[PDB]
Amino acid sequence: VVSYRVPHNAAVQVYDYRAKRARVVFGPELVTLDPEEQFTVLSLSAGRPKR
Amino acid sequence: VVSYRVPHNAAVQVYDYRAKRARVVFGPELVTLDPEEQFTVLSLSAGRPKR
Amino acid sequence: CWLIRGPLEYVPSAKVEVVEERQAIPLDQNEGIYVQDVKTGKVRAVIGSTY
């Protein structure tokens, strides 16, 4: 069972595609992906100033 | 059992992921991490003036 | 097919064949695996205690 520990001051969004329901959680907790849940892959700017 | 001695004037934050509860302790004490507790790894500025 | 478990002693009866030795799955707090009920194809995720 794939599970990711969420950082203290951060958040993560997932969607249970099989059941048709979204959910979002924040704080120092661990998200446990259901059989058809998937993380929201968020490509952000970084590098040196901003890429 | 992993345990860290906290410095006299400092603090450390941990989170028991299995039980869903955060805790923070300060003073010259020792923190004993529960089976699924983890330290808050805080990357700070240092080096010569500030990195 | 069927499964036999429990602290006992089995022997191949004069009608049946052994397929495999069901073992190797220990889970703890905030841990688990994905299992698919082949008869119905019901993919699910069991977590917590050993299963």
Side-chain angles (χ1 to χ4, degrees), chain A residues 7-50:
Chain A
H8 267 94
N9 283 129
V12 293
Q13 178 176 39
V14 307
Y15 193 102
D16 192 27
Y17 284 83
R18 59 154 253 87
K20 297 291 182 190
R21 180 176 57 264
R23 72 178 196 184
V24 61
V25 67
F26 9 63
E29 279 75 49
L30 36 69
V31 186
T32 328
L33 293 167
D34 267 311
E36 295 289 317
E37 274 186 10
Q38 287 298 149
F39 289 121
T40 309
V41 188
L42 183 73
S43 184
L44 297 174
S45 300
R48 179 76 287 172
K50 55 180 180 181

Side-chain angles (χ1 to χ4, degrees), chain C residues 4-42:
Chain C
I4 180 176
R5 212 230 317 101
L8 64 96
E9 51 183 329
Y10 189 69
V11 63
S13 183
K15 272 183 280 181
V16 73
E17 187 182 29
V18 63
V19 183
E20 57 168 311
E21 297 175 16
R22 278 260 198 280
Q23 190 168 3
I25 314 149
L27 309 315
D28 302 317
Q29 295 91 302
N30 310 141
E31 191 173 28
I33 71 292
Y34 300 109
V35 301
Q36 183 175 35
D37 197 322
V38 188
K39 270 190 163 66
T40 176
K42 181 67 185 298

Side-chain angles (χ1 to χ4, degrees), chain B residues 23-40:
Chain B
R23 72 178 196 184
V24 61
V25 67
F26 9 63
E29 279 75 49
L30 36 69
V31 186
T32 328
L33 293 167
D34 267 311
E36 295 289 317
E37 274 186 10
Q38 287 298 149
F39 289 121
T40 309

